[PDB]
UniProtKB/Swiss-Prot annotation:
GO molecular function terms noted in the UniProt entry: aromatase activity; flavin adenine dinucleotide binding; FMN binding; heme binding; identical protein binding; iron ion binding; NADPH-hemoprotein reductase activity; oxidoreductase activity, acting on paired donors, with incorporation or reduction of molecular oxygen, reduced flavin or flavoprotein as one donor, and incorporation of one atom of oxygen
Effect in UniProt of substituting residue 47 to Q/S: 2-3-fold decrease in binding affinity for N-myristoyl-L-methionine as substrate
Documented effect of changing residue 251 to C: No effective fatty acid oxidation. No effect on electron transport from NADPH to FMN
Biotechnological utility: This protein is a target of protein engineering. Its selectivity-directing and activity-enhancing mutations have been extensively studied and the designed mutations allow this enzyme to act on non-native substrates and/or in order to enhance production of synthetically desirable end-products.
Gene designation per UniProt: cyp102A1
Binding site for (9Z)-hexadecenoate: 51
Consequence of changing residue 86 to E: Ineffective covalent modification of the heme macrocycle. Extensive formation of Fe(II)CO complex in the substrate-free form
Protein name per UniProt: Bifunctional cytochrome P450/NADPH--P450 reductase
UniProt superkingdom: Bacteria
Spans annotated as Cytochrome P450: 1-442
Function field: Functions as a fatty acid monooxygenase. Catalyzes hydroxylation of fatty acids at omega-1, omega-2 and omega-3 positions. Shows activity toward medium and long-chain fatty acids, with optimum chain lengths of 12, 14 and 16 carbons (lauric, myristic, and palmitic acids). Able to metabolize some of these primary metabolites to secondary and tertiary products. Marginal activity towards short chain lengths of 8-10 carbons. Hydroxylates highly branched fatty acids, which play an essential role in membrane fluidity regulation.
Length: 442
């Protein structure tokens, strides 16, 4: 029997559109969800979508025979730069499945072992930076985590060194990336087009240096350049290879920087959790450099990372459309092409799944993950359109956080007040700490 969806306050002909005129629209959508419940309609001139918050409804929306990935307004904009790269292609575009099949083997267990030494190269630069600070100096947490994650995808994925740790100023790639993208929220056209040229010359250099190289390679770039899809039998064409390089250099670092920064925020705010994870790191990381196998034994560090993704998943929403007319939850009829948005932070606060203490930071929720019902925990998206870089993000973050907890004690010296900046990702803006060295050599 059919139900009418709640809707938040309207503004005449503008409908709900003005609720999004805020620098924190995900946070404002979470509040609407606390007020309206598991589903609400959100209308704008010429548009409608439905925001989902409960596991009981999201488990249906994750049914791939009924719903496929939709390009959100944001992906539609990013598409101007990332083209039909993995993240911004429709599932039905030839190049989505070709590139999925060609690039999947770049995240196999054997590929992950291949990347480990270069992840260590970066993680050691981070540890050295902090070792080298003078007394009383502090650390800008998301700034340094972005330094780490950017350098990690450039080097592991492309054998390119952004050398972020030699810079106190942004890398010309990144800031060009940002102001070209903003320059479609006279003159700022030699400027926007200076930037696009920055992006294009970097992609050009990545490709050309690989070709001029006589070294054998099995990294991500090697797959883009040489791999053949077993289905079509075809390799990627030059145009799509370019889009994939841009896709992975951005998707491959921003969300991972967020996760690291929230995890450390939650550790400093919960000193018993911090002590338990530091104890694990001291017990397990018995050598000067961690090995692949040692990172795999950092069980509790990995539970910390999942509990940080539970509360602040750093790609906080994904969009879907109905493949055919269908009824959601036995209550809401949908027509072919109708859109749904999955509000992941709210899914992750569903008290029917997690119990009443949902706001508490408790990594022990992840002790027995087979206990979690289907579709309840979704920081990496859904189905065949789920994050292809999941294992890469979690290996890098477990390695790096384990090393941080081995080498330093941390102080929340400002009593930092959580302030979450929203871009394509989320981060704790302005988060700073002091790190006192434990004086353990590398
Ligand atoms: C903790 C860090 C990360 C988070 C939370 C995350 C989250 C997500 C989510 C939610 C999606 C689905 C997007 C949608 O449905 O519209 C996705 C897709 C994707 N991610 Fe990640 N991601 C992370 C790290 C990475 C890394 C390190 C890489 C690359 C190495 C990456 C590459 C991609 C790509 C290429 C897709 C598109 C996959 C496809 O549709 O075929 N991500 N991610
Ligand atoms: C970092 C992976 C990703 C890809 C698309 C949207 C948000 C995050
Ligand atoms: Cl529990």
């Amino acid at each position: 029997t059919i139900k009418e969806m709640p809707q938040p306050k309207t503004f005449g002909e503008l409908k709900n559109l003005p609720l999004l005129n805020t620098d924190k629209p995900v946070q404002a959508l979470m509040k609407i969800a606390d007020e309206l419940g598991e589903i609400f309609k959100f209308e704008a001139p010429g548009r409608v979508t439905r925001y989902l918050s409960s596991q009981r409804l999201i488990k249906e929306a994750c049914d791939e025979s009924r719903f496929d990935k939709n390009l959100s307004q944001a992906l539609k904009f990013v598409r101007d730069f990332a083209g039909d790269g993995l993240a911004t292609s429709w599932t039905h575009e030839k190049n989505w499945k070709k590139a999925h099949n060609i690039l999947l083997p770049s995240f196999s267990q054997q590929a992950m072992k291949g990347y480990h030494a270069m992840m260590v190269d970066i993680a050691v630069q981070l540890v050295q930076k902090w070792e080298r600070l003078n007394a009383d100096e502090h650390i800008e947490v998301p700034e340094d985590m972005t330094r780490l994650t950017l350098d990690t995808i450039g080097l592991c994925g492309f054998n390119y060194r952004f050398n972020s740790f030699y810079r106190d100023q942004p890398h010309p790639f990144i800031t060009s990336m940002v102001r070209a993208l903003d320059e479609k929220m006279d003159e700022n056209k030699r400027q926007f087009q200076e930037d696009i040229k920055v992006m294009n010359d970097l992609v050009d250099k990545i490709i050309a240096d690989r070709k001029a190289s006589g070294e054998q390679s099995d990294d991500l770039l090697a797959h883009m350049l040489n791999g053949k899809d077993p289905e079509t039998g075809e390799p990627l064409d030059d145009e799509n290879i370019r889009y994939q390089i841009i896709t992975f250099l951005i998707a491959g670092h921003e969300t991972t920087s967020g996760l690291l920064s929230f995890a450390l925020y939650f550790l400093v705010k919960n000193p018993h959790v911090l002590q338990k994870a530091a104890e694990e790191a001291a017990r397990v990381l018995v050598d000067p450099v961690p090995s692949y196998k040692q990172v795999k034994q950092l069980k509790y560090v990995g539970m910390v990372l999942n509990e940080a993704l539970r509360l602040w998943p750093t790609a906080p929403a994904f969009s879907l459309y109905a493949k055919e007319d269908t009824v959601l939850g036995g209550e809401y009829p949908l027509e072919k092409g109708d859109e749904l948005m999955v509000l992941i932070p709210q899914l992750h606060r569903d008290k029917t799944i997690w119990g009443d203490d949902v706001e508490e930071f408790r990594p022990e929720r992840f002790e027995n993950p087979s206990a979690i019902p289907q579709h309840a925990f979704k920081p990496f998206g859904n189905g065949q359109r789920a994050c292809i870089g999941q294992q890469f993000a979690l290996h890098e973050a477990t390695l790096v956080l384990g090393m941080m907890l081995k080498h330093f004690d941390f102080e929340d010296h400002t009593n930092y007040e959580l302030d979450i900046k929203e871009t394509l990702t989320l981060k704790p803006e302005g988060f700073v700490v002091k790190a006192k060295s434990k004086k353990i050599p590398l």
